[PDB]
Amino acid sequence: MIKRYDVAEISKIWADENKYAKMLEVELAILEALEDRMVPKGTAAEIRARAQIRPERVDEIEKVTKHDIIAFCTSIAEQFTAETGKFFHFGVTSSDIIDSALSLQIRDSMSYVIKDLEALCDSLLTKAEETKEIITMGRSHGMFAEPMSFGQKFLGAYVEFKRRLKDLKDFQKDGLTVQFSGAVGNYCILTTEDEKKAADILGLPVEEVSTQVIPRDRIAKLISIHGLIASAIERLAVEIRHLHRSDVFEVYEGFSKGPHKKNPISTENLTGMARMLRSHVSIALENCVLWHERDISHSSAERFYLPDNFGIMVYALRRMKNTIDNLVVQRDIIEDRVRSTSAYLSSFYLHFLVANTPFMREDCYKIVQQVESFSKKLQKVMHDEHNIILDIPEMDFEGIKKTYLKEIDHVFDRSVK
Amino acid sequence: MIKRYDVAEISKIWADENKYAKMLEVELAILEALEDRVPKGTAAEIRARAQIRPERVDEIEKVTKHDIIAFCTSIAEQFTAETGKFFHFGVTSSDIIDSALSLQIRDSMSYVIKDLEALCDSLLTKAEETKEIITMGRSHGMFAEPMSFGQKFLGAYVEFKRRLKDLKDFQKDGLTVQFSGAVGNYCILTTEDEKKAADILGLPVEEVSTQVIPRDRIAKLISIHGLIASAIERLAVEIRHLHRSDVFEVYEGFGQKGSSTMPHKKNPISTENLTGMARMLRSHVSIALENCVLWHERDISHSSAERFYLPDNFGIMVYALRRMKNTIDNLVVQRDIIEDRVRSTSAYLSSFYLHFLVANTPFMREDCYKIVQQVGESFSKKLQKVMHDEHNIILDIPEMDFEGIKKTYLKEIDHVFDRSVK
Amino acid sequence: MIKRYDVAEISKIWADENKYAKMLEVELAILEALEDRMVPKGTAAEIRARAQIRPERVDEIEKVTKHDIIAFCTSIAEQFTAETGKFFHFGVTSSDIIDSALSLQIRDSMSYVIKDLEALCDSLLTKAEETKEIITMGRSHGMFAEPMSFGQKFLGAYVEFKRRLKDLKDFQKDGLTVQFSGAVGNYCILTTEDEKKAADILGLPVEEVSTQVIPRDRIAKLISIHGLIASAIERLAVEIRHLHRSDVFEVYEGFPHKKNPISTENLTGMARMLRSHVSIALENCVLWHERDISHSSAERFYLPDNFGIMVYALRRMKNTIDNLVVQRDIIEDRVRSTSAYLSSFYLHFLVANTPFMREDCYKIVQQVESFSKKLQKVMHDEHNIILDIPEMDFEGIKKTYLKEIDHVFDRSVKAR
Amino acid sequence: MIKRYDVAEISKIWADENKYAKMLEVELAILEALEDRMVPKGTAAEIRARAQIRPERVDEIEKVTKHDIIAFCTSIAEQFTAETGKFFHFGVTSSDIIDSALSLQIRDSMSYVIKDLEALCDSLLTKAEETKEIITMGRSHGMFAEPMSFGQKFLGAYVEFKRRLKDLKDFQKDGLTVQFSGAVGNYCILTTEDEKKAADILGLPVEEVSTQVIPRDRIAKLISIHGLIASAIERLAVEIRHLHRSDVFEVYEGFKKNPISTENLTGMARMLRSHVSIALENCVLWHERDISHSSAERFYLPDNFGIMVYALRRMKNTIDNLVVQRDIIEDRVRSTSAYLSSFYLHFLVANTPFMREDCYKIVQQVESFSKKLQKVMHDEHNIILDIPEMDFEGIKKTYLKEIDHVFDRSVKARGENLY
Ligand SMILES: O=C(O)/C=C/C(=O)O
Ligand SMILES: O=C(O)/C=C/C(=O)O
Ligand SMILES: O=C(O)/C=C/C(=O)O
């Protein structure tokens, strides 16, 4: 993480001050659970009141112990009497407290992700309803295709992020677990009853089968979800970058307070942001390949990409929302492009004569191509030349919008559950 | 996909014939929906005589340069000008492809689910057979504390059952169909015609579609398959560890010649082969992610890649699940070699003795550590003697014999199994 | 590989017939070297003439033996006597023959790539010299920046693919090796002299340290070169896709047929495929001790397609470049319709010449047919500066921006 | 990047002050070249004397302008009079200074990586010297195969890192460029003469064809090699972790014994691999530029060199301090025997007219193996030949026969005679 995109509350969760404090919150959970066995009643509350998080001293102790778990508990043990810290960190293994506290840093980070994601979904839906009645020329392969609702470009990103919102909220109810199983998950000292009571205090369910560590596929699943959101971010930014260029010139980003040129510098940044979150996916997958009950190759990688994952995501979910809000939509440039193009009308009259006349395609194709009001005279040819009586619709600007946007109301409500 | 790893039922789903066979059903599903607006029985009449001719489509495509128009030309040339008049009417080409691709994916997901359920059955079988086998747990590859050998398979079991439910969650709704026109404006078609045509196929309507269905659904499935690649790789590495000559706890059951000069040398060729398969599956998740960023209402940039990895990814997914199941069943467990390693090591007893004294006595940590150091005699009764004689305290120390170790380190093996089995 | 994207010459190399063929060539290369000592002379040449290559026979034997190399050598042995096939596959390990023959498939495939790569470099420079004098609007962040030579675009990809071309030419000389090192590379029966003889027969250098296998980071480096080519292709295809769109409409893919950049969109997905294999080869680098067979199944998948997609993609991009239709007037009418970029040109003109500061020269330019005469009228009257401002009409715009286009082309092409 | 693995000299290369200092070095390179034109002579040396880099001042200006280079110019411009700073940042576009200074940072980051990688090959070679004499068991699929030299494990990793060192020094020669071509590379205000002159002041060659930015295939060419280097780092790490396990117990890292070093470096290799895809995607820039690479390059470029320098020196120390337990090595060779049956099989077929399947039943039937075998074939088979007796020293003389040749071909200078 660098200072330019840093969000202080996100990096605070992954700062060593919160890393050690979450470890301590897990230590007091298993200590309070063991109070029903060999630990005196009230010992956990005694430590919870006077415990001080001292990261510099831990690093000082870590130089001697060469292990962050031995320096942490020592920094807590030297603040109390030997009778007090007797059963502190008792029965659990090193990664029992590390990963259980690791899942705490992940739970609290998800709240910032889910909140700003839903705030982004609302900003997209808001921008869709403003531009729902603006008609634009859809582009297939970059070519003009048929007129559509310009709000559907925003409604398309809305329903995508909305599917991502269900992915995160499903994980929040399930994927997060903790472990108090002991050394290699064999419960040499503790019991599953102790793990149950301790996990009940923390508020996260119990790992069904846990080795020395927590199985890394659970974190991998969450990071793979952020990869899906990144492709949604990138697709939305590419949409904005396309309509921002001079050849299109239908949207541009706000210029804050203040040589004055319009440039899509915001959504280009959000493209690089998505490139970072996409790269974390394989990292999460490789961290799943551990030897027997554990190897610690996942730790250093998690120290890097886990703080950047939530940090980049929250900064991206917030920057994307504000960029949509400050986005300037130029309606006259959007709808004039629909007026100047008429090539899509060749297929409209084609499907109209095929549907309402008993003529084949080639017969219906030769009549339209052989053909002010393109509707007025083509209707006369059916009655005069073909002796067929029917009323075509007038394909002026009001007939175009009424034809192609006649279903946009149904698309919006089927999007909103 | 190559013939060496080709799976019959899966390769047929993605071949040219069944590709067009599903596109035909999509053409007739929307055609029957248009019969309310198209004469009655037109889709049923085309359904009864339709022929899928992949060689003919290839010849039409050499001129038209459009696979869908070539498929339409091959189908319309089988009927009258009037009978095939409303064929491919109102829909866009991608309305046919993506709606049919879902039926292909669904037919592939049905086999993967069944093959993934089968692997969970085998893992839970070996977990029960090797449940009461005591083995040395290893952290950083180092001897740690003894544990159950069946805990390894149960650990892999619940992992595949996590991905199994995710697949079933995707099976309930992860795929859609669409009939939205050129750029999703529903100019010629209607939502009523689109919705009703979907129930003929049996899939939900895409909520917001452009020319194509959003690619994040395919990417979501590939994501569930990306995680499975990790699950397959870990179980493969685990058995590769046990199979080595230095450990020699298990070996893959094999007329088969393992080596040239040593018939039959036992090598973990199955779990190693599956590791290469996992590397191929993982690499596809970067393609499916990049395919989501399509320009405006569509670009065809995802078609070339999807023609490559989608048939291979499903073909490998089915091949890998089946071979791992055959390996898990035929893997033979050397019971004595596993348990003879646990007796040869005494290091884990010192940890249990010191946490026994701290829990049962008022002594502190480093006071207990020096006691167990100075302590063939019974380690339990000799230290219980010094507790009574030298330190003057009475405590009942369970004796750490070979079966006393299994009573200590396999204590919660019942509850771990109970909460794991569904 | 699939039938739609199958290339004839490339798929021929990776077929089981040639796969078994190059195995035989490698086997006969070491056995010919073993004739100098313990093997009767002339045995390798006798097997070379009578040995059939029967994939249906190998698969018939492999169904039992579960060992591809045993089934291969057995199929070759049964076509000779016990006295002609005595020392066939003697002393070598199974991967001595596989990895040596695998490099042969890589060598011959690589020649087709370099051929079709430099051929794509020819199409790019041909289009570059054609459109050198054309002037177009440059775009930064998609927004109109300044006028530029349209030929600089194709030259930008020319030198990029030229960079990838030298990387393969460097690799083709120093990239591949063979081996005959025994079971785990300890040289029990085999000697370095016999191995060097067989290697000199095949024509490839010897691996420095050989385990049971050849270090797979050699393959991974080749793929890395091809991974960069995937981005060079995608960047070039993305450029054509942008110019093709209706809002730009500067070029279109040549063949009422409908105009879409369908070929460059095809190459975008191809490029993602070539880029997907780079991390595959990297994970194959991490073997266990002397070897683990994990890399074979993955290479049986991605290597035949990596070479296939590469040649297939380079050829289609070559055909698309030559047949691409450039619309010169629309390209140059867009420069006539843009105006605001001249503010930066007149600004630096008054700064570098008139002793006025940046804020002073800015004021007057936008306060101010042909702008050069108007600005020079202001400098001569109120400012009272006598200076000659060059005409900024269409022809004068080409002279200003394309003034150094000769130096760019000459420095980017060796003999030019 | 985090302080836990931070290399101060590397994180300072990519810190804010060195970033601007290299940009200011590039700004004065073009300004000095323009002294042969409209810019007054000696103006570059004028600004270079009293130039003060103020990161927090630049951040203050960018908080309003939302443009990093305008903020970087204002901080340098306002320190002098208008006439002196009149020609500062003149004719160049932003990315002329952004990317050309980025090449200066990368070059400085490359100077450290080359040294560490070179020193790792020396230590790996040194460790191969200490362990060359030790006979070990070669493992195929983790299974016992044939005996080999233990030092060949360090020699195999040595020649791989040396191939990566040859890749890095090749890129060191031609790989980094500077650009002064202007807005879209059109040389509107400047000339190729101005660009060529300022390039010698910076010591780097001129980019052949540059758009608004420098094409990202050069940086991608460097990050790709770092992924190749990381592949060597994980293969060597997994090797040590294999020989470290309790069942093998053939090595242990120097100072309860855990391979925490090579496991941590294995995690270092995973982060470096992910950088490749970002470097490959940073090349796909729209037209003459888009800035989407910038935010990514602000992250993985300092993280790549920081992790790489750390991993090359930690693996060197791990190799420096790795303890080799020779007693456990060679007695594992004495314990098991299987390759011997393959040896006598290849020996009988070589020197006797019998066939492979004939000699296999003879070797399997069988105290001294060589003596007993030499008597069976002269009794019932009537074969007179010299069968070498293969004991521990006899096995070493056979399976380590060509070990000196593998070493001489692996090291360029070894084997040459001097004086
Ligand atoms: O008719 C179609 O569905 C395809 C149109 C297109 O190729 O743009
Ligand atoms: O050549 C052998 O001994 C067999 C080798 C292998 O199975 O790789
Ligand atoms: O004047 C410059 O160098 C920068 C211009 C820009 O911000 O694009």
Ligand SMILES: [K+]
């Ligand atoms: K645990």
Ligand SMILES: [K+]
């Ligand atoms: K559609």
Ligand SMILES: [K+]
């Ligand atoms: K070998």
Ligand SMILES: [K+]
């Ligand atoms: K430039």
